[PDB]
Specification:
RNA binding (chain C); LSM_dom_sf (chain C); Putative snRNP Sm-like protein (chain C); homoheptamer; binds uridine; mainly beta; SH3 type barrels; ribonucleoprotein (chain C); 7% helix; Lsm6/sSmF (chain C); 5-stranded antiparallel β-sheet; binds uridine-5'-monophosphate
């Protein structure tokens, strides 16, 4: 039982809102639909935020894992 | 269900997409094919800047390591 | 003496400081990690030069962004 | 089910292409061959800067990791 | 002659200097390392421009940030 | 019939080449050998800047990941 | 009969060399060993920051992925 590895723990967020910070300072929010071991992700109803402003609505999007800094839980 | 990201990408073949690259370039076009490295081939592609078409390229091969995200966007 | 990734096991459930490429810093409790150095922290906070820029809660950090990991001190 | 990207690139062999590299740099030439890393060999290659030719290089081997995209040239 | 990573073993338990990409630098006692060059330092301190910016205690440094590793000096006395 | 890039490079052994690196450094010398990572050994190597020889290095080993492209020097 | 690059590098063992790094740092010293990643150990190492000595290091282990080129010194 003693603690899931990080990529297994990530599965606990499937179908939940998440916050993704990317290299280069970009930030996105959306519902996590799937991921793989490279940390590539597919999000639904995604938006890109900038200085607290939604600067773009990305709909369903695939984010390439090597651009990611961190993934955290979003409002909800 | 829910396919892994690279399998789910198959559902976008023949759909219009928006590709954002590292370093800010953006491309819009119809996804024709892809592979495991995320290398992509788009038809009727154009490069954009600030919501502006700066170049019309037709069919282009995009190297996968340059990709930040692939979006299906909004109507 | 344990190899680096095995010694890190010593910090599970302990407060840590994660310094990233770009000067961003995270402080939180280490819950798990994997061989790529991907990490899960609980009660995490993000910092931009001593200033707590955000309270994340549980967060997954991609290992390729890490510069170092050191011992921190727990919150209240 | 169409060709994977690197298999489709084979249809441009002996044709004019535009190679965009990271850093606004760009090459034009006839595609002679390539490999799985996307390293390429171009004939009658010319390097460009802001639409203007900077150097005529002749045959050139370009390392794949420098590539942003490949498109066809109107040559 | 030993290969680089094998010769590094001779520096275990000795003070070293770790120069990183971007110029920071760490000084401390080398406790262990692995084949990716990740390493563990005891009594570590971070420096920038030669001035110590913080004392970290025991630290795990990810290897791909390393430029070089050399030996450190002991206190002037 | 169509030599892959790294096999074709072998045809430049012992001839003058020009190597452009990331960050715009440029070297010229006689290609002596190379490997699959594109690491190279050059004889009579010279570093160039702006267009002028800024350094004479003799025999040099260049690490492949720094390379942008390799082309033929002058006879 | 030419040796592959990493094999040709063996010829410089126990000889003075110049190591130029990504960014721009430069080191001079005697090459003692290396591995397939191009990590190197130099003896009597000295760093040069634009034409001249800025730091004497003694023995140093340079990580291979930082290297741009290696040439014969002196
Ligand atoms: O689908 C893919 C394939 C590779 N990659 C990246 O390519 C590298 C592949 O190996 P890695 O997953 O162990 O890091 C690494 O930088 C990955 O993030 C993706 O991000 N997505
Ligand atoms: O000790 C190490 C481990 C990896 N590396 C680097 O990591 C990569 C590993 O691939 P390589 O085994 O082909 O050299 C490559 O870019 C290396 O230069 C080092 O330089 N030193
Ligand atoms: O045709 C290819 C081959 C590889 N890569 C990926 O791009 C990076 C280039 O250094 C590698 O990590 C590799 O996974 C591509 O994008 N396209
Ligand atoms: O999910 C993953 C998979 C791999 N890596 C590591 O990060 C680097 C990304 O290029 C690789 O060398 C790999 O070892 C991660 O940080 N996270
Ligand atoms: O001769 C070589 C060796 C490696 N690579 C890089 O190493 C990765 C191997 O998949 C590719 O993405 C590619 O960019 C090259 O471009 N050329
Ligand atoms: O814990 C790790 C795992 C990977 N890497 C780096 O990631 C790449 C994984 O193949 C290597 O080149 C290596 O430099 C590290 O520094 N530390
Ligand atoms: O001596 C070496 C070893 C590796 N590489 C490059 O660094 C990557 C290491 O996995 C490979 O794709 C390879 O092209 C070099 O340039 N030189």
């Amino acid at each position: 039982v003693n603690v899931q590895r990080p990529l297994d723990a990530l599965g606990n967020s499937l179908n939940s809102p998440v916050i993704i910070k990317l290299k280069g300072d970009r930030e996105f929010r959306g519902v996590l639909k799937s991921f793989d071991l490279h940390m590539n992700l597919v999000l639904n109803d995604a938006e890109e935020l900038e200085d607290g402003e939604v600067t773009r609505r990305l709909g369903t999007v695939l984010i390439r894992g090597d651009n990611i800094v961190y993934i955290s839980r979003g409002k909800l």
